[PDB]
Amino acid sequence: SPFPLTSMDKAFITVLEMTPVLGTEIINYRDGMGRVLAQDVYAKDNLPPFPASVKDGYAVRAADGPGDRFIIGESQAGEQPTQTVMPGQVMRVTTGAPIPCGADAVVQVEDTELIRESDDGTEELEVRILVQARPGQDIRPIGHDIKRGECVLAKGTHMGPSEIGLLATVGVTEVEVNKFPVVAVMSTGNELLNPEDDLLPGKIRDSNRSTLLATIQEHGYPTINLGIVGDNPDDLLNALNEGISRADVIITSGGVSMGEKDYLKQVLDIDLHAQIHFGRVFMKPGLPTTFATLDIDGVRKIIFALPGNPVSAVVTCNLFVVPALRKMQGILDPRPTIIKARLSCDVKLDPRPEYHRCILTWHHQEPLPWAQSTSRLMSMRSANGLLMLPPKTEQYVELHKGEVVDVMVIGRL
Amino acid sequence: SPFPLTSMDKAFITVLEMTPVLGTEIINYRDGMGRVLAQDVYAKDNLPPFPASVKDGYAVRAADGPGDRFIIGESQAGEQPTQTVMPGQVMRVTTGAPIPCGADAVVQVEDTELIRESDDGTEELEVRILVQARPGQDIRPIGHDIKRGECVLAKGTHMGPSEIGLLATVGVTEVEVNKFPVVAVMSTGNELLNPEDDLLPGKIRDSNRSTLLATIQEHGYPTINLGIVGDNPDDLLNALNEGISRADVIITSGGVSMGEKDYLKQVLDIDLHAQIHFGRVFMKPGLPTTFATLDIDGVRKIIFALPGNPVSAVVTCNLFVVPALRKMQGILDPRPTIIKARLSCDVKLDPRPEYHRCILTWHHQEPLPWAQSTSRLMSMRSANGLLMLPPKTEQYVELHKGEVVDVMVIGRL
Numbered sequence: 075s076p077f078p079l080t081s082m083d084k085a086f087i088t089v090l091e092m093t094p095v096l097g098t099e100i101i102n103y104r105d106g107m108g109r110v111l112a113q114d115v116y117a118k119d120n121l122p123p124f125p126a127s128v129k130d131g132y133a134v135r136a137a138d139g140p141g142d143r144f145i146i147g148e149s150q151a152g153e154q155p156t157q158t159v160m161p162g163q164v165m166r167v168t169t170g171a172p173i174p175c176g177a178d179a180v181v182q183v184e185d186t187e188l189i190r191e192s193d194d195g196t197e198e199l200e201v202r203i204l205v206q207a208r209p210g211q212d213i214r215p216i217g218h219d220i221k222r223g224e225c226v227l228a229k230g231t232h233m234g235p236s237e238i239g240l241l242a243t244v245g246v247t248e249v250e251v252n253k254f255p256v257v258a259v260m261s262t263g264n265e266l267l268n269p270e271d272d273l274l275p276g277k278i279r280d281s282n283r284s285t286l287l288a289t290i291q292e293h294g295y296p297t298i299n300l301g302i303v304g305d306n307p308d309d310l311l312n313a314l315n316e317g318i319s320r321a322d323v324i325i326t327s328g329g330v331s332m333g334e335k336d337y338l339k340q341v342l343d344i345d346l347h348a349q350i351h352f353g354r355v356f357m358k359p360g361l362p363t364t365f366a367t368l369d370i371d372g373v374r375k376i377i378f379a380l381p382g383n384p385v386s387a388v389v390t391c392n393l394f395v396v397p398a399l400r401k402m403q404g405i406l407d408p409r410p411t412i413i414k415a416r417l418s419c420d421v422k423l424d425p426r427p428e429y430h431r432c433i434l435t436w437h438h439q440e441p442l443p444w445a446q447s448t449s450r451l452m453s454m455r456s457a458n459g460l461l462m463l464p465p466k467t468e469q470y471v472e473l474h475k476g477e478v479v480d481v482m483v484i485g486r487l
Numbered sequence: 488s489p490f491p492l493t494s495m496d497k498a499f500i501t502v503l504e505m506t507p508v509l510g511t512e513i514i515n516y517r518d519g520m521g522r523v524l525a526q527d528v529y530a531k532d533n534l535p536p537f538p539a540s541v542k543d544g545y546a547v548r549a550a551d552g553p554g555d556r557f558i559i560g561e562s563q564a565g566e567q568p569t570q571t572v573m574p575g576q577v578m579r580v581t582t583g584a585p586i587p588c589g590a591d592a593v594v595q596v597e598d599t600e601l602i603r604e605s606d607d608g609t610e611e612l613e614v615r616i617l618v619q620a621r622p623g624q625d626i627r628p629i630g631h632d633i634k635r636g637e638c639v640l641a642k643g644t645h646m647g648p649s650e651i652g653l654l655a656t657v658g659v660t661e662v663e664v665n666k667f668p669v670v671a672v673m674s675t676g677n678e679l680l681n682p683e684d685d686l687l688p689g690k691i692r693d694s695n696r697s698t699l700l701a702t703i704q705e706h707g708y709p710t711i712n713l714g715i716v717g718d719n720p721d722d723l724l725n726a727l728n729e730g731i732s733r734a735d736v737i738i739t740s741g742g743v744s745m746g747e748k749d750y751l752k753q754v755l756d757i758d759l760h761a762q763i764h765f766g767r768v769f770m771k772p773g774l775p776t777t778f779a780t781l782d783i784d785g786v787r788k789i790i791f792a793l794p795g796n797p798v799s800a801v802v803t804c805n806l807f808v809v810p811a812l813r814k815m816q817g818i819l820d821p822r823p824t825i826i827k828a829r830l831s832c833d834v835k836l837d838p839r840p841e842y843h844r845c846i847l848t849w850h851h852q853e854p855l856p857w858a859q860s861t862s863r864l865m866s867m868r869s870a871n872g873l874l875m876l877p878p879k880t881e882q883y884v885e886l887h888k889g890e891v892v893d894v895m896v897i898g899r900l
């Protein structure tokens with residue numbers, strides 16, 4: 075128009091406020107990594123479901139005290155005992171085996187001495203108990219860890235390996251979760267060739283599509299590759315319509331500044347009738363970043379039209395797209411983690427808030443990491459942070475090596 | 488035997504020293520996430536491959552100075568111009584378009600005023616240049632960003648999205664990388680049922696297999712599910728032989744303490760003829776953790792026999808297995824990231840170094856994160872750290888809330 079310069083705060087809040095939460099589906103628990111539960115999950119059994127030994131040793135009567143005992147048998151892991159321990163008797167137990175009737179404590183083998191075994195040294199017959207056990211010692215009573223009827227996982231839980239293991243424990247193998255967003259990515263520009271092409275005069279290879287798709291995939295979301303689209307409104311409209319049909323989220327790059335052949339914003343508004351919430355952001359890089367929604371058939375589609383410059387595209391993808399995707403897949407607080415780190419070099423501040431990929435490194439002595447902006451060993455590592463520099467003011471015009479700055483985590487630390 | 492209590496330092500060093508690096512394979516660049524390059528990668532083209540405009544504006548002769556100029560045409564993105572700019576002339580350019588012959592600078596449109604356009608307002612004819620440009624301004628010369636013949640990625644680089652984008656840029660779509668390890672996981676114990684089973688007397692559901700497989704999958708490595716194996720040497724040997732055939736790494740859990748039906752270490756030594764490098768570790772939890780190698784047909788197989796206790800299994804998997812897998816897939820320094828964090832509560836120290844899953848959280852004010860050991864909102868989050876508590880000494884017997892401790896990162900922050 076030009077569109078108003080939207081502040082970074084307002085643009086980010088607008089993305090989260092306008093992005094929908096996807097519907098739910100039932101999945102197998104093994105497919106639950108990174109999913110958010112849409113239901114509370116309850117145990118239908120006690121854990122342990124029988125009183126269970128914590129130790130290799132003997133199930134005893136605490137009231138017998140220390141002394142010499144006849145071993146009446148062994149409680150085997152996986153088998154309910156049938157014998158009752160009576161005074162002067164014990165039963166051998168292993169870790170995880172059930173406690174027999176008549177015993178109220180376990181004495182670990184280290185607190186015993188063997189007296190007699192069968193001539194074939196395969197059976198223990200008599201043992202000396204060297205300690206006074208307390209009732210209940212080294213036994214997990216029924217339900218000690220989980221009780222039947224207990225809610226073991228709450229709706230809203232963002233699951234990792236231990237939550238999957240908990241579902242396995244309680245036998246809840248099918249769970250309701252939010253869907254993951256399907257994200258379509260297209261590149262735009264008459265100068266672009268595919269990565270697989272040799273160069274032709276006036277042309278370059280499309281890198282943004284690969285970088286953006288890889289970024290989305292790294293977060294676990296399914297993607298659709300919509301290819302390269304030329305700088306013309308008909309082709310852009312057709313590609314957007316395909317994205318809308320096939321995906322929940324459409325990411326484009328290129329064609330969002332005010333250039334003679336930058337058509338995306340016109341197509342979004344005039345042809346698609348999408349609502350453009352912002353078309354410029356007061357940020358460096360990323361000035362022409364554009365965010366639109368399209369409500370069709372009771373469904374809200376999300377469209378990010380990112381800048382064409384490759385660094386701008388990947389930075390703005392991490393700032394705006396990834397948090398939106400996290401909200402869509404049901405994460406209750408979708409904001410990225412921000413950590414404090416020390417600047418590795420002096421920096422002159424821009425009037426705009428400025429963002430730069432960096433590598434966070436901890437030195438085993440120092441409490442704060444260093445942020446090295448993108449060495450023989452550092453060239454081996456991928457960026458895992460986005461430095462977040464404050465706007466310059468009449469007071470603060472520069473920051474110095476060692477000073478503390480905010481860094482958004484964008485990769486595995 | 489019992490096996491010697493191996494110090495944590497020695498056990499960890501032994502794992503890394505004895506673990507092999509896998510062989511290489513050629514992959515498509517799109518499949519490169521998390522891979523390590525086994526070759527240097529070179530650009531075969533310049534970037535840009537033509538002198539490219541940084542701006543929407545006009546390609547000018549700097550020597551003409553400011554003034555009124557005839558527009559002789561437009562350089563289009565993706566098209567080599569054919570006209571030569573002569574004195575008193577300019578050519579319209581867009582960002583990324585080639586600079587025509589005869590021009591040596593770009594003046595952005597904001598530093599100009601239009602004089603005349605065609606009656607049909609679709610063609611600019613005459614423009615006022617308001618600034619004195621410097622030769623080269625707002626042009627990326629050929630090779631400014633990447634030069635033909637330049638090494639753009641070194642062998643040993645652990646690739647993320649931006650490295651994939653760089654491969655796309657230079658058109659190197661096939662790259663040599665280290666293989667990922669195939670990791671087989673089995674559970675052991677006569678008391679175990681599958682997650683899909685209803686409980687039977689004396690039995691519990693196998694959770695370790697799910698938790699361990701999910702942990703490995705979270706790191707991107709292919710897995711093989713070897714199921715549940717009973718406490719008997721024949722079945723254990725057969726399952727290990729299947730793992731050895733199908734996988735690079737075999738993980739078991741259970742059956743590694745000194746109990747009457749704990750057979751794994753006997754099978755590994757006597758039947759498989761594997762070399763057990765350690766069979767106990769002075770750590771809490773994880774005392775019976777076992778690490779073995781098996782050299783067969785010039786190939787080194789890796790076997791981790793982890794403790795059966797579910798918390799021990801997941802802790803020891805993160806401490807020993809994940810670093811080994813990182814070395815196998817070619818990461819040069821496979822050690823996890825260790826960060827400094829503040830303890831959320833007082834802790835009594837054990838004679839053994841102690842490890843506990845926790846959640847790291849940053850508060851937007853404070854420089855160090857807090858480590859909360861595994862709240863309405865915190866129950867929504869998965870563990871992302873492993874607290875690393877030091878052994879007790881005659882001097883240090885306890886640590887207090889707020890004191891700084893080491894935390895190993897085990898999840899996305």
Ligand SMILES: Nc1ncnc2c1ncn2[C@@H]1O[C@H](COP(=O)(O)OP(=O)(O)O)[C@@H](O)[C@H]1O
Pocket residue numbers: 261262263265266278279280281282283327328329330331332333336362380381382383384582583584
């Ligand atoms: N997919 C892409 N891969 C690599 N470079 C790109 C890609 N798309 C655009 N570019 C380049 O980025 C720069 C800006 O492109 P442009 O389409 O003008 O972005 P915008 O108009 O959104 O600011 C140009 O140099 C252009 O060639």
Ligand SMILES: Nc1ncnc2c1ncn2[C@@H]1O[C@H](COP(=O)(O)OP(=O)(O)O)[C@@H](O)[C@H]1O
Pocket residue numbers: 169170171674675676678679691692693694695696740741742743744745746749775793794795796797
């Ligand atoms: N896969 C599993 N899932 C859940 N619990 C398990 C699993 N394997 C073993 N356990 C339990 O862990 C505890 C220790 O098992 P055990 O086989 O004695 O380990 P180890 O001998 O290696 O110390 C027992 O209570 C046992 O039932």
Ligand SMILES: CO[C@H]1O[C@@H]2O[C@@]3(C)CC[C@H]4[C@H](C)CC[C@@H]([C@H]1C)[C@@]24OO3
Pocket residue numbers: 082083084086087393394397409410412482
């Ligand atoms: C409202 O926008 C402000 O908060 C936001 O939330 C968080 C918690 C998360 C990171 C970051 C968000 C990605 C962009 C906006 C900035 C700030 C400008 C951001 O910083 O910190």
Ligand SMILES: CO[C@H]1O[C@@H]2O[C@@]3(C)CC[C@H]4[C@H](C)CC[C@@H]([C@H]1C)[C@@]24OO3
Pocket residue numbers: 495496497499500806807810822823825895
């Ligand atoms: C040699 O073992 C010591 O260093 C190791 O390396 C690092 C850098 C990485 C984490 C951790 C490793 C997983 C276990 C051993 C500890 C220590 C006991 C560990 O701490 O810090």
Ligand SMILES: [Ca+2]
Pocket residue numbers: 262263264328329382564583
């Ligand atoms: Ca363009």
Ligand SMILES: [Ca+2]
Pocket residue numbers: 328329330331332333336382581582
């Ligand atoms: Ca443009």
Ligand SMILES: [Ca+2]
Pocket residue numbers: 151170675676677741742795
């Ligand atoms: Ca067992």
Ligand SMILES: [Ca+2]
Pocket residue numbers: 168169741742743744745746749795
């Ligand atoms: Ca055991």
Ligand code: NA
Pocket residue numbers: 359360361362381382383386
């Ligand atoms: Na930009």
Ligand code: NA
Pocket residue numbers: 772773774775794795796799
């Ligand atoms: Na253990």
